[PDB]
Amino acid sequence: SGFRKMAFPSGKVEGCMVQVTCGTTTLNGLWLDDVVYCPRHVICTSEDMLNPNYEDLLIRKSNHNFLVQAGNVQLRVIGHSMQNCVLKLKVDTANPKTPKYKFVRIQPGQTFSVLACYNGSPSGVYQCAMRPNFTIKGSFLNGSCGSVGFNIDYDCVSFCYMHHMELPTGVHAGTDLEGNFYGPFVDRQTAQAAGTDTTITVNVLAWLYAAVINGDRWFLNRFTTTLNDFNLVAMKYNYEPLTQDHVDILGPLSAQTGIAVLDMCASLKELLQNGMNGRTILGSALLEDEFTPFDVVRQCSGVT
Amino acid sequence: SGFRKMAFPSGKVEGCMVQVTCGTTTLNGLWLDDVVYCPRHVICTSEDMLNPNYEDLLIRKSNHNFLVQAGNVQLRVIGHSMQNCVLKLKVDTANPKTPKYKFVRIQPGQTFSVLACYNGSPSGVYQCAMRPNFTIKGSFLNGSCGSVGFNIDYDCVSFCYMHHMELPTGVHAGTDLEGNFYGPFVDRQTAQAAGTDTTITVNVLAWLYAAVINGDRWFLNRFTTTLNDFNLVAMKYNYEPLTQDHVDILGPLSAQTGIAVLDMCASLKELLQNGMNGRTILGSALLEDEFTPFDVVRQCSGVT
Ligand SMILES: *CC(=O)N1Cc2ccccc2[C@@H](c2cccc(C)c2)C1
Numbered sequence A, B: 001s002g003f004r005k006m007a008f009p010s011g012k013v014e015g016c017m018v019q020v021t022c023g024t025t026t027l028n029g030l031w032l033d034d035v036v037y038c039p040r041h042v043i044c045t046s047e048d049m050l051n052p053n054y055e056d057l058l059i060r061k062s063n064h065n066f067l068v069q070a071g072n073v074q075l076r077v078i079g080h081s082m083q084n085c086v087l088k089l090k091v092d093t094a095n096p097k098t099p100k101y102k103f104v105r106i107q108p109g110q111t112f113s114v115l116a117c118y119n120g121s122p123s124g125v126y127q128c129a130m131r132p133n134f135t136i137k138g139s140f141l142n143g144s145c146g147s148v149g150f151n152i153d154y155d156c157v158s159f160c161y162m163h164h165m166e167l168p169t170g171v172h173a174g175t176d177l178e179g180n181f182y183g184p185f186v187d188r189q190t191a192q193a194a195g196t197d198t199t200i201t202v203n204v205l206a207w208l209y210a211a212v213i214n215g216d217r218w219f220l221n222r223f224t225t226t227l228n229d230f231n232l233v234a235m236k237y238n239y240e241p242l243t244q245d246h247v248d249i250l251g252p253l254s255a256q257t258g259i260a261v262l263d264m265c266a267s268l269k270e271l272l273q274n275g276m277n278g279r280t281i282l283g284s285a286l287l288e289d290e291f292t293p294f295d296v297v298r299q300c301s302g303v304t
C-alpha cells in the first residue's frame, strides 16, 4: 500500500541524452539511432530569440557548427535538417544504448515523466501532466531545453515531449518529437499567455479511487449524481467536463473498489462544494489531477 | 523556474536490480560487485513471518537454494551470510554495471529516491524522506521488498535504504545496507506501531525559500521571531524543534533570497497559526517537508 507521485525508471532515457552546442548556446539533445533531436533555438543567441527567422539563421549553420558530445566523446555530424521546431542532427554513429521507442503526441490530461538535464547530463526525474491549456508545470532552468518527457510500456519508450521554453508566468511549453508545439505556443521571446488551467476531472476521480484502495475513505458520501449534474458543478469549479469516455476508462477502478463512477463523482462534487475542512487525501490537502486512471492501475498492480 | 518533487536519475540503480528467490518467496536484490544484498526474510514463508528465528531458518538453506536472476540470466551463488536483517549472497560474477557506491545510514529528515521493483524489474522512481519516527511513506506492494533508497553525488550512488516491511497502518519500514533497521522495527509479522510523525521543520523552511525563489511570496510577513519563540509554536503543531545547526544549513538560502532565517521562521509561525486560507504554495495546500535545504539548492542550481 501507499500511493506516490511516481516517475518511470529513467535509465533508458539517460542513455540517450547528449549535449548540443551551436556557437555560444548549449542545450540537451536526444540521441536515438543515428539522429540527435534538439530544439531548433540552439542556433539562436538570446538576442535572436526576440524575433527569430529560423530558416534564415539556419543558412549560416553547417554540420560542423553543431557540437554533439555524448558523455566525454564527440559525435560526428554528417547531416542536419529542421522539422517544425526541432533540429535533427544526423550523426555517423548509431546510439548503442538506443531503446525500443516511439514518438507519440499526447492529449491534455495525459501524464509523463521528465528527465531534466543540463549539458547533456541528467539532474533528476519527475512526473508531469500535459495541462488542458497545453502547458506543463515542470522544473526547468536555463540549459534544460532539449530535456524530454516520456512514458514506458515494458521495454518501449514513447517520447512525447521536448522542453523548449518558459512562459513569463513560469509555466512551461514544448513540442512533441516531431517538433510540433503543444498548444498555440511559438519558440520566440514574446509574451505568450496561457489559457485557463482547468483541473483534469478524470484524473482526480482516478486518484480518489487510489485513495479508497489505500485506506483513505473519509470523503465517500451517501450520494450519487448524473454526468450532466456533475458537469454543472465541474464547470463552476474550472474542472474539465466529464464524458462517457472518461466513465468508461474508470471502469476497472470502479470494478475493483465496488464504487460506481457516478457515486465517486458525487463524492468529488461534495469535496468541491464543502472543501477538505483541514483534512487530507493521500497526504494532499488539494485534489490531485496528475495521475491518469492508467497510472493508478499501474501503480496499484505493480507493472514493471 | 518551477519546483518539483524530483527523484535522482535511476539508471545507475536499475543496473543493480536482480530477482532473488528462496523456495516460494521472490523479492528484489541489489547486486554490487560480486555481492547481492537482499532482506533476510526471503528465506521465510508467510507463516514463518509470525515469529521467525532467522539463524535457525538459515541452517536449512544452502547456496543453491538462493536463485538469483539478473535480467534473464542466472547468477551462480558461491557463498551466503547474514548481516543483521540482510543476506549477502556472494556470486561468481561481479556486476559489470556496478557504479561507484557507498553505504550510508541517514538521519531522520533526510530525503532519498526509491526505485520500486518487482521480480528484479523497476516499476518506478519517487522521492521519500526518512520520517522523524523512522518510517517512510512509500508505495510498496507485495514483491517490492529489497527495493532500495539512494542519493547520488555526481557519479557515486550512496545507498541508504532497503525496503523490508509495511506496518499495519500502511507506512513503511526498512534497513540501511548493513541490515540495521531505521528505528525500533523488527522483521516480524507482529503489530508494531509508529511514533508521532512530526513535521521536518528545516525542510519546510527550505521549501518556503524555494517558493520565494520561484515567485510564491504571498506568505512573507512583516514579522520576525527567535529560535525559542518559534520552537514553542513548533512544539504545539508537532513540528521538529529548530536548532542553530538547522539555521546554519539554511544560510545559503537565506543569502540568496535576502530573507533572514528567523524572518522565514516567523512566516512559518503565521502559516501554522492562521492556516493557508484556501491558498497554495508551489501548488501545494499543505507545508511540504520532503525537500532538504540541499535538495532546494541542488534543484534551484541544476546540479547534474
Ligand atoms: C530552455 C533553455 O535552457 N533556454 C535557454 C536558451 C538558450 C538560448 C536561446 C534561448 C533560450 C531560452 C528561450 C528563450 C525564449 C524562447 C525560447 C523558445 C527559448 C530557453
Ligand SMILES: *CC(=O)N1Cc2ccccc2[C@@H](c2cccc(C)c2)C1
Binding pocket: B025, B027, B041, B044, B045, B046, B049, B141, B142, B143, B144, B145, B146, B163, B164, B165, B166, B186, B187, B188, B189
Ligand atoms: C516487501 C514484500 O514484498 N513482502 C512480501 C513478503 C514475502 C515473504 C515473506 C514476507 C513478506 C512481507 C513481510 C511480512 C511481514 C514482515 C516483514 C518483514 C515482511 C513483505
